[PDB]
Design a protein around this nucleic acid. Structure first.
Ligand code: YTA
Ligand code: CA
Length: 227
DNA sequence: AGGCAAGC
DNA sequence: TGCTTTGCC
C-alpha cells in the first residue's frame, strides 16, 4: 500500500475520476499488460496539477520515493503520472540517477513508459556526461533486455545536430540482426528521425549496411524520393 | 492547430 | 499496408 501522503492523495484523486468505459479500450491498446483507470493524458495531467496546487511539490529528497510508489500501483496511469512528476524534478536529475532510470526501464516495461524515459531523461544526462556512455550503452546492448536495447538506440533520438553519428551507427550495427519488433522498429525510427537532420549519411548508411527490411523501409520513407 | 509518431 | 485513435512537438 502506498504510504507517501502525496501518492495517497494522487491515488484517491485519480480513482475518483476514473472512467470504466475508457479503461477497457485503453488497456487493450497496450495488449492488456496493464489495468487502466480510464484517464487519458489531458485529464491525467490536470489531475496531477490539482494535487500539486493543494499540497505543493514535495521536497526533492522524496522524488524517488514517490515515483517508486506510483510504479507499484496496478493502473498504468500511475506510471505515466510518475514520469510527469519526474519531469518536474529534472533540475535535480543527474548521472547518479542513471541506475534508477535503468530500474524504471526494466520494471513494468512497455513502449509507452520506456519511450517516455529514454530520449528526454537519459538523452539529457548523456549530453552532459558523454564520457559515461561506454559504462552503460554496451552493457544494455549485451543484456538481451529489449527495453534496455531500445534505450541504447533511442537515447539520441532528439539530438538532431548533436547526434554522435559514429556511435549511432555502431549501436544500430550491433542490434540490426535482432528478431524483435521493438528493436527493428526503433532502428527505423531513429534513422528516419536523424535523416531529417543529416539525410545524406543516413542514406549512405542504409545503402551499405545490413538492416531488417522493416528497419530499412522505415528509415527511408521520407528521403527515398531524393535519390 | 496540425503534422508526424503504437493497434490491427 | 494503410487506415485508426491519441500523444508529442
Ligand atoms: C520524441 O518524438 C516523439 C515521441 C512520441 N511519443 C508518442 C507517444 O508516446 N504516443 C503516440 C500515440 C500512439 N500512436 C497513435 N497514432 C499513430 N498514428 C501512431 N504512430 C505511432 N504511435 C502512434 C500514443 C502514445 C503514447 C500513449 O501512451 C498512447 N496511448 C494511446 C491510447 O490510449 N489510444 C490510441 C488508440 C486508442 C487509444 C485510446 O485511449 C482509446 O480510448 C477510448 C481508444 N479507443 C479506440 C477505439 O475505440 S477505435 C475503434 C482506439 C483507442 C495512444 C498513445 C508519439 C511521438 C511522436 C514523436 O515524434
Ligand atoms: Ca507504421
Amino acid at each position: 500500500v502506498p504510504m507517501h501522503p502525496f501518492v495517497k492523495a494522487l491515488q484517491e484523486h485519480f480513482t475518483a475520476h476514473q472512467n470504466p468505459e475508457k479503461a477497457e479500450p485503453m488497456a487493450r491498446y497496450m495488449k492488456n499488460h496493464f489495468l487502466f483507470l480510464g484517464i487519458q493524458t489531458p485529464e491525467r495531467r490536470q489531475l496531477l496539477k490539482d494535487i500539486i496546487q493543494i499540497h505543493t511539490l514535495p521536497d526533492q529528497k522524496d522524488f524517488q520515493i514517490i515515483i517508486r510508489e506510483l510504479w507499484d500501483l496496478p493502473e498504468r496511469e500511475f506510471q505515466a503520472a510518475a514520469l510527469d512528476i519526474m519531469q518536474k524534478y529534472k533540475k535535480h536529475i543527474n548521472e547518479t540517477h542513471i541506475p534508477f532510470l535503468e530500474e524504471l526501464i526494466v520494471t513494468k516495461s512497455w513502449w509507452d513508459s520506456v519511450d517516455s524515459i529514454v530520449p528526454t531523461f537519459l538523452g539529457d544526462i548523456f549530453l552532459k556526461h558523454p564520457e559515461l556512455i561506454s559504462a552503460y550503452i554496451p552493457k544494455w546492448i549485451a543484456s538481451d533486455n529489449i527495453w534496455l536495447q531500445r534505450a541504447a538506440i533511442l537515447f539520441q533520438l532528439k539530438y538532431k545536430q548533436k547526434m554522435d553519428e559514429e556511435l549511432l551507427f555502431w549501436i544500430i550495427g550491433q542490434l540490426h540482426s535482432s528478431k524483435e519488433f521493438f528493436i527493428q522498429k526503433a532502428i527505423g525510427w531513429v534513422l528516419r528521425e536523424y535523416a531529417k537532420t543529416n539525410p545524406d549519411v543516413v542514406w549512405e548508411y542504409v545503402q551499405n549496411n545490413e538492416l531488417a527490411p522493416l528497419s530499412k523501409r522505415e528509415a527511408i520513407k521520407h528521403i527515398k524520393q531524393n535519390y
